[model samples]
Target: KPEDVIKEQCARAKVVAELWHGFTGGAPKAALENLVVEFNKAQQGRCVRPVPQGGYRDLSTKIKAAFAAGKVPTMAQAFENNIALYLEAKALLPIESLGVKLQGVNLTFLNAVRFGGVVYGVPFNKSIQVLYYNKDLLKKHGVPVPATLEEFVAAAKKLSRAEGGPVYWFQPDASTFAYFFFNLGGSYLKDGKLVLNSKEAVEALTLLQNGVKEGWAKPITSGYINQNLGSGPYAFSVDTSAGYTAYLRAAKFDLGVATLPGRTKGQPGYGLVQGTNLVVFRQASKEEQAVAKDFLEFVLSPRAQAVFATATGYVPVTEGALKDPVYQAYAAENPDYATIVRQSRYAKFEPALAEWEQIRFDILGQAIKEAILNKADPKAALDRAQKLAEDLL
Candidate 1:
């Protein structure tokens, strides 16, 4: 069936086509059809058709199935963190090996897809995090905009009402604390050691738990940030700006913004670059890689990316993409976007190590739970987290 599918898309010898899989929620899906059309036409009939995807989770599984049976799509939508699976397994064709170097794709973002320090992919639809707060809520409670962790804690205290099943502060998504704790300067890997229980990590989780005990923040059971924050009573929610843009148009009230504050004295909370990176795979040939590079160049071109920055809520990943007139204008009006963009300079995209999934999920999540639950010791919890993360290596 997939062979039939590939045969149909590549039926025209003049064209080479592929399916884009594993695309999660983002602007890439909405903008891609037109971009694909532009790509097909630009290659002088070298690209014919595409089968787009609505999910990234099933990509490799599907691709692995396809490959095992001798069927492979020319392209797929993959994020940086997962790109290595295909690359190292020898399932992907390194773009460099093909003798085509992508000229305009963002290196800052591309670095995420590198294997052993060699870049293997280009980025698509990149975004960074920001704090979104209800302006009305802040003003009504007479709370100042939080500029530092102290201000953040103070605001949480002010906005909390402590009555009638009302809850507040929704930051703990399964791996959310792990994603964030390190941004506060907790290291998962350092000096050939995993360090999740360092003094820094303890303090961050301690602050979170104390927020609950102090009745300043409530941990919700719903396990969804968008629904919880979108419905709101709690003062602030922090998420990638791309995730917040839709809510901006759809929010019940005007919003205020700030960077993610750190638990450490001088550190601003760190964020990692998120979103997919465009990668060249073995399924396509040298000429196709050239065209793919060209297509990505077109996507990242001065004019196209500026429009991209405007049309999609994502900030550009390349410097050229970053400096576009479109990027500047939109960022000027949305100072919140600017705050995130600047903060992103300080943010480190998390490691793409193979054990990352477990580290974020089973390992660190347990640590956070241990630290938060009454029966556990904070230091012991973090030490266990540190040990578990080290075990991952």
Candidate 2:
């Protein structure tokens, strides 16, 4: 329970704002729909709902428009890559501005959400990507979950076919062609340098491009195929740990869990830290900020997490959230939660710099796409991609 002061603050901040897209289309279907029902009824009319889209890129564009017009929501969930721009623009408020102490939160994530030196968002719905395999499929093929990068390549190769069938390879976001090479260690760049190009990176890119070349993997992006592919001929799909609840409920197959394959016997690979982030905008009123802050606090409670996990399949951000019987039951029935927790032992976040906005596509998209096409050496393609990134950055 919050203090009377906080309650008063929330009352003052009551603005009846929409929680936005996914809540019934612009207000259709995120967990926030339930909040709209409860809070709208309680407040009569004092909340605003901002529209987001089916994906982060669209939402990013929407936020950009809102930012330019100075009409952002009191708080909005942000992409990790975009948070820095909001911070750089000085258009969003740091969590500390509201004077809420982050006593029990995982500070590692807290620091991750900060841009430059100021904390700009309170992260919730955090997830890491993990390997989701079909043990049934693996057994039928006499293979197993890959424990090492080489082993992964062998398993994928063994599982692949040129018969125009579904292959057990990486998915859109899990494509190792993006960063697996440099992830072997060492800062890929040092104060503007070409240090990102490495042998490991080349090897990884070759394997990624080869998977597609040999008809071992498909270039399927997520909008339509990904949602339904869980029921297709594919033997494996590597996605976010936050997908457990929804995937478990919706998937019509046996899903096995494991940490993503590593580069060496003991060395695990890093994944793009997955999940939703929330930022409070300066365009919001002082009272709106108060309500937004309170809402964030409410999200941290065990009760909220219990319901949230049940609804969204995303994990609660703190240790306390994990202690809930709801989470335990979900994990017990699903069992994949252990793999999610285990994978975090080697979680890696993207560099949330201002330059990352366009660099993501210019560096990753073009380079990885070239590898898939196999027009030339993937290493050269990656080198060219990194050079462009260096120039742009």
Candidate 3:
């Protein structure tokens, strides 16, 4: 079968690798296809085909089912947590074993892919969360760009006009919650146990709850905070910095940008590093794996990285990409885009364990949603979540 597959591509003088990924139907999908096409055209010995596998959640589900049926893509884009799950399935190929060069690649991105001292993947499009604000609205309400958590809360209270009007809109994603947790000097893991209910976690969440209780903030679960931001009545939103362009396009007023608020004025601002990584599977033949590796190399090349970061709004992973001539020009043209890269130094990763997604979406998601929406007691919600998390571990 391996020979047959290679033969099929050899007819065209190249071996083909199938890459199933979550880049489906959007700017990201378009960029993926564009880059893969470029790779296919440039490489003389190998070509790769990228197939849409739905969103990240859908791709993870399909990969598991495919693993059971003895079919896995030559390579797939997976999150850090999913990489852990695939490792538990013993289905991943250690990237170092492929003889791929990493001398110039940024190890900071690689850190997220390293588990048990082995790297299973390479970082792809990555980002850090930032505070997106409406400049005109902030001025109208006499609210300064909030630099500290206390200032952020005060600004929200000042900007709100009534019970239904909110100054800041926050999505209830666990990753965002984790960003707040880290910024507040809270730890998620302690001595192999989930400590998301630690005192700091409780305090951070209580701050958010109090903002909502004061009628100055609201929880969002469905879409970008831009949904209300574009029309007014809302002034600021905390979302991924990579989403800056999207927010820019939606605003009817002057848009503003700021690093995520810190716990104190002089404290380093922190955010969660959010994005996907690429992993090769062990199910592929050695030759197929080689082709996949070549494809990844091409994708990581400076030219491709430049185009990807500019087009998709994702921060480039390597310093080479950050310094690419094209990217430099674009960043110069849009200074806001450049701040995301600067903030990466202080960003942190989500939990890297196999059960992280389960806890993040099911347990922590429920805890946050209930606390923010149902007005449930923060400590009680976190305690229940921590108990469930311990059982998960």
Candidate 4:
């Protein structure tokens, strides 16, 4: 019966589902390629091929070009804003339409891909923001691990030198800004309008601006902060959990990871969920769509999730994946990952509006640079950003 079943399955027409992604090298690329090989070997009449399209920005551009030229791949990795754009064009096939039930996938991550309560994508490489600190530096300076934003500021002041350099290297990016903004009770959108000038927004920006002005926080202009962090001069930095491997490779000190500091003590704080999702294109044939759907389901499975998370530093999209023996073994060896995993409980994703892509990077990012680097007032900077964002909205 097993042989007959295998023979019957193989009797179907073969389909090669093309999956476009942005994983260029290292563990992410290797893990994905290995998974594709495993999926191909297990399938009877179908296989999935990954098309690496350089970096995320390059992939985004190429995907848009492909859609415009009417030659999109079977499926591709996309951010929430990209999904919104494709949905507006009616170019994406809802995962629900594929008859695949994404049972046990984390609802927080699921929310990122849901529009109008319709599921359009599946979370593939979701990550949350986390606080990374130099344990050796903090302990040497007698600075206890900061539990609150105020504590973090105090720690920064104590660890930094007025004449020498800053201890905290703040990266000027919207995602990093959103992490502190959310933890300080700010929301990006409310009542169908931009809330970039909210009290929390002002306070979040003021904290960073004051830190820079007081000579305790340095704003990173280019390159990964992990390199600066590894050099041992920096005491604290907030980065995505997916960068754990990079941090491990670069850091020579006693590295410590914790959830982002809360606005006040006793709260675990909030994090802005980052990373992309996988969406199937409507252009694919029925058979191609079927195989792509199968690949998605396989990617979401516990074993695959465990394999992916253990190899790469991404958080598994489902609770079942966390309990997988593969992940449990990895967790036993590296407990810092648990700090990243714990943030999943309070992490929230950004708005899925197509306009968010520009507002986040172009407007909010510039506002942060203006306030922190240019010594502009935080409220004025955000107010200016709010006005710019309203035009897009």
Task: Name the candidate that leads on lDDT.
Answer: 4
* Each prediction's TM-score versus the true structure: 0.80, 0.83, 0.92, 0.92
Candidate 3, which ten residues in sequence have the lowest lDDT sum? 1-10
Ranking by lDDT: 4, 3, 1, 2
- Candidate 4 colliding pairs: none
Model 4 TM: 0.92
Candidate 3: pairs in clash: none
Off by over 4 Å in 2: 1-14, 18-28, 35-50, 161-166, 172-179, 186-188, 191-196, 221-225, 228-232, 264-268, 374-376
Clashes per model (N, Cα, C within 3 A): 3, 23, 0, 0
What lDDT tens digits, residue by residue, belong to model 3 across residues 131-212?
8887887777567798888788788887786324777888876866776788778887788766779888888778789878
Q: What is the per-residue lDDT of model 4 for residues 243-275, given as tens digits with 9 covering 90 to 100? A: 778888888888888888897777777878877
TM-score of 2: 0.83
The local lDDT score (0 to 100) that residue 124 gets in candidate 3 is 79
Model 4 ranges off by over 4 Å:
1-14, 162-164, 230-232
